[PDB]
Amino acid sequence: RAVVPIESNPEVFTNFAHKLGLKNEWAYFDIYSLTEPELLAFLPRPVKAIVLLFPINDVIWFKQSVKNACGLYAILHSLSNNQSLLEPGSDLDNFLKSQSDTSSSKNRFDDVTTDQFVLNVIKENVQTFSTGQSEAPEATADTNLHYITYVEENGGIFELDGRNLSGPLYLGKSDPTATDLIEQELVRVRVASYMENANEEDVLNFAMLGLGPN
Amino acid sequence: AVVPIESNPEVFTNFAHKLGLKNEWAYFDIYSLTEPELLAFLPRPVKAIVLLFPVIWFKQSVKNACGLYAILHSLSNNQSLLEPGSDLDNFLKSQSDTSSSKNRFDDVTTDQFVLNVIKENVQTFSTGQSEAPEATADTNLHYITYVEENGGIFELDGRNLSGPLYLGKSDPTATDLIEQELVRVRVASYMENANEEDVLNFAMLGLGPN
């Protein structure tokens, strides 16, 4: 009921993602500058989802049920709202179509059915939670850091957090003059607002990953 | 009590020129802050940024005068853009000579210099593209300024009794203030409280070449 907190590592996220069903043509990448011309040229486009790691201070959403599993739910938020990037017949693709046929929870996956598929994905990928560049803590331990995700679905911009009991958070309408998610002012502003609290506390604990090609 | 100044680049530029800002410089509209194309149209280097929303520092003493103090903060921390001999330049050097308040102006010398600026320019406080409210009435809107001084980045508010606020060190890859992440982030955080509240009351001006 407790997992080792996943590292904000493009390789680890990409690993998990591919095993869930993300097509090989796509991957997660490092986002180190979010309002930077040059740097965004070393960044694959279109950016289809953005995962943010930071201190806790009309779309598919999953309620988080397993401790330290926020990173896996971020991947599930990124992939489930971008079905087009999944491999037909992959574990996640099968999971999503099964609930749409049966019309269980059209978009709020809080079921004992969602928990079992997550608990098995977890049981089949336990060592992956521990990989990365940094040393693995103990699942039992608290982290003070949390992952969350952004996506554009049917013209809107949403922030998806498995721990936000109220469900997905609507940020407002998309801007059709957006090459992708990085060019959405509603995201940059929402993100920049978190960093401002960081800058005040003198904490540098922030990371972002984007899901794009390659 | 003065009439609240309109976030109009012509009005800011007019006041600034009368105080001493060289003619080669002026205030301009900033409509987008993280967008490429729209940045090719804005004059660089941007030396100060004024924000309207819901290191020399000046305490605000006159009601609704925040916009003038914003111009004072923008200009006073950019002395190299002032006309030698102009009114503000004289005022600034005077206090340096006598060493009154090396950077925190809350004196007698400063409240007079300002009331003198205020009374020599009353008519411009009402100009622009909108209608003039009564100086007596409140606005709910405020002016603050951002400047890069000694590689430090500051937010200047005449109403912040604690004085200027340091936001941290500058980034030298930055040709100017628009390219300072610390400013964009601090501004962006004000807008987010505005995106939640459905308030669209926001304006920005940059001080750059004419």
């Binding site: - | 309109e6 976030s7 505005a194």
Partner: peptide, 17 residues
């Protein structure tokens, strides 16, 4: 398109104290 993500085409001309 406003600045946040008395008009002039959008840029607002507001008054602040």
């Amino acid at each position: 398109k406003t600045l946040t993500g008395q008009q002039r085409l959008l840029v607002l001309r507001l008054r602040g104290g």
